[PDB]
Amino acid sequence: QTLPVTVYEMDFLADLMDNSELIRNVTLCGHLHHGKTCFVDCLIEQTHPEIRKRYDQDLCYTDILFTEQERGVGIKSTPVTVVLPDTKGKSYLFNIMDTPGHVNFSDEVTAGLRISDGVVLFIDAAEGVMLNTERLIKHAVQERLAVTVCINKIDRLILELKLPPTDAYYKLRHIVDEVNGLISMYSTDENLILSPLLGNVCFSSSQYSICFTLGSFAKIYADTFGDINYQEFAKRLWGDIYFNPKTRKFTKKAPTSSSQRSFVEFILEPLYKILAQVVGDVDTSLPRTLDELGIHLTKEELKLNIRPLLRLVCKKFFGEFTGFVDMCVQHIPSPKVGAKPKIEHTYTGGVDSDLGEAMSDCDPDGPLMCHTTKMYSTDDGVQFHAFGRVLSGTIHAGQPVKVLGENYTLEDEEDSQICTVGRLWISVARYHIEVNRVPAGNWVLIEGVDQPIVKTATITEPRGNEEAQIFRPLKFNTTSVIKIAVEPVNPSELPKMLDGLRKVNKSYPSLTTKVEESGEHVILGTGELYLDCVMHDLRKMYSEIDIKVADPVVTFCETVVETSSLKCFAETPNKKNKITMIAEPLEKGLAEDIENEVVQITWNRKKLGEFFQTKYDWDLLAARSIWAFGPDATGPNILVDDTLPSEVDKALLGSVKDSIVQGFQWGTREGPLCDELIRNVKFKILDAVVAQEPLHRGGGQIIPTARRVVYSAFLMATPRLMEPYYFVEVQAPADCVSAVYTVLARRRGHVTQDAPIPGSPLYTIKAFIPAIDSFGFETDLRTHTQGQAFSLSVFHHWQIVPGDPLDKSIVIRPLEPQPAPHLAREFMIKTRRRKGLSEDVSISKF
Amino acid sequence: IGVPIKVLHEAEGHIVTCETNTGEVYRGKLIEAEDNMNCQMSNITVTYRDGRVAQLEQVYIRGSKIRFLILPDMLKNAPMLK
Amino acid sequence: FEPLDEDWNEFNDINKIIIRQPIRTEYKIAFPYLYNNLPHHVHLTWYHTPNVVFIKTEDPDLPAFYFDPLINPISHREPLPDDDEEFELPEFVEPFLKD
Amino acid sequence: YLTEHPDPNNENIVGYNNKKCWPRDARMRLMKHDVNLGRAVFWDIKNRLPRSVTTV
Ligand SMILES: Nc1nc2c(ncn2[C@@H]2O[C@H](COP(=O)(O)OP(=O)(O)OP(=O)(O)O)[C@@H](O)[C@H]2O)c(=O)[nH]1
């Protein structure tokens, strides 16, 4: 096969995969536009002699789609596999996943954190900590990965702000302190202190190829002057420690008043002087500086423009990126060491199983266990390639394997298939290297299994491994709430669109496409640019037809506020057994504790009740009476028992509860108002008259009956609607802040925080907005503030829509923005009309 | 520093076997190696001069007493040797 | 520019559409595939560039690296080893480019 | 009508003769029930005439 020229032999990369101690699985992440893909470009140019950046444009080696080239943002997380040397000279295998930093593509990061062991967070030195950085610290800690932070774009402290050296040091220290605070807020482990003293924080400028920790710059001193222990000298170039030039020692007190810190004196001021002598004094004193630092340039190399000459001088000075390799080796575990928390967190059945102890050793021979999370398209768009990691065993080209879906259990055995692998590749961004086998510990790109795979899959052996269970599905960071509806223009081309509607379902992890009862094809999404890319990929790649799209709306939910006025009783049509229920709302903050798994089912009734009686102050009769919660396995609704044992025999009532929970599950999704999920309710059984014969206790009589019980209890207790609220952070100059207050005033929002950025003239505005008002919001700010303000929106919470959704006295004139009391009625009626229900629902319907 | 010391630092993490001036052959995974030939090794099968096979789990060999080392065979594609 | 007749349907029913904010032309131009039917010859616009925070120099007598009061102030406030374990540099070792 | 002529893709909207001289809210609104009723009416009238004698 043909391959570009590489500084290492490909047989060395083939033989280096067999040792799982020299492999690192790293995910690069961060906020939007902080320097991820350019750092990957610098690594690719480090490994390849023939790939060079243009003098006017960026390279973007790992942005291979045309949408990423026209938009200028990252859309798809792309892997690359390289071999890099460290400071000591030892070669290491890196599997690097470049993930996008935009918030609406946060699902592209969660698919990247499942198949990796360490996180490298890029932070802009000028802007600092932002929204998606704060969300990704939480999401990377809760997924139990190691965390390192690299501070990119330090030259914006030099060439844009023109900032004094100790003030730039204070800016960097403030960024590191805010990162340590965001680590310590969500972690219970105290051994996660990030500091450059520990080799844990790197400094970089992606535009001019600058990358250093303390140890690499100490190695530069050791290569320049000699006879200096660089591992000891790098331990004192940070913090309040001073060099005393008389004693030639490092003391913690000031020799003079003009004494600078050691980081300013030995590291940061030579960086200022290099950049200043390249930019300002190229004509007079640059050859004196380049003769002093030991750098020789050709006469044609001196005649370049300022930015490529600065890139060339910093590349000749700093050289290879050894500090990043030192950080990723020292503080990110190998897959042989870090396999145990990965199997403990991601494998169903626990690490204490028989197969879990076999997978915890990273054994390259034995049972084949692979977990594929990502699906990549070809050039033609007719077939997909799966992408995942090999947890155990060794996968072979041509080996018949078994593909396990996300609905597979040992009891069912329905969601499974036997397939044949065509080829195996290891992935670089713009080319692929074909191999015949991949051992355990690496990443793998599998051809020929793409037919049963929807979101993720588990690749196992056909014979043996009969106790194999699937891994957990992806737990996404946010909730997709935007509804759009699609139709084809020519109605005879409906089987074509249903092709593409299941093809973009594979390449997008958080995408949800469904078919309503009225025949509408509804696609869920997270934002405007997300569904823009959905439409581009859909049409131009998988449909080649014309598709009509409707106006976007958001997903509503249903709730109660007051206690029900009357006890809701209902019988089965067998007229033997009766169930009576009171519906009440939950307390503030309990639903959010159920959703974040602070409270859980399958606990052995003790700690569960102690939570309710400790924090929210439930009684012992109330804490010891939960039957189940949620329509989904952790949903925010509770089925509660208030049936006294003096009136209802609890030994016979515990037999029908297995059907009453199926009833409550099937009826807390698709509620009675507009067929949506119920929020923040406890459904409390007070009276139950249970049948005596077992044939009258069947589920076919009682499950629609318990459905009608839940519906009657919900409709009596003053039902309301709930809409999602987005959290919005706006980066803007100090003059357009009043214009931001002006624009947010007309979309029913409110500003919660207005804070200046330390070390920057730009301000941050943090606010909450309704999601249905957020259409064109970014365009309104970027038009009204002359393009200076910029905004991002994530899903934050749910609140009650103002108005009565059952007030039939309200008349609604069409095509007019209604005021505040008419909103719940308008939303409820128009969603019923859109989904295909009746014009109204009555109180005595159920 | 020359080439064979860089080849020694490359063989860390793999299985090497060393013979020293006391005629004893130590086989196992090399953990650490310096500029001088001080070799920290682990999971060691030990062959004496008479022929007894022993199991020693942490060995630190001084580089002065070393006769020679025997390296893996896939280091012929290492970058410093090409 | 000069240009380069739709019946009612189940799809474009205005009793289903919630009119909250009026959709403008620049919404259809910024995101040309979400709000447009038949997008034949559109081009994807450039999304965003980070805000250049460069401050112009108005006084030639000031130093080039000066804490301009246009910049917001930084609100001021670690395992450091002890002084007694004395690490001494050699005599000819200096910081880079001190001349 | 739908017993002999099934419509799985809802294709009976395309091919519907409509009067373009009126405004959009003034002419016939093409809801699916009314279009199916119109197709059924024209089918029931067309069945009563032998195609060798006359043709609609
Ligand atoms: N001043 C300066 N600009 C930089 C530096 N690194 C990157 N940039 C610029 O910032 C812009 C965005 O860089 P990217 O690397 O595309 O940003 P990104 O992090 O890939 O954005 P995502 O697509 O979210 O991953 C480009 O114009 C880069 O040239 C740096 O060190 N200094």
Ligand SMILES: [Mg+2]
């Ligand atoms: Mg990028």
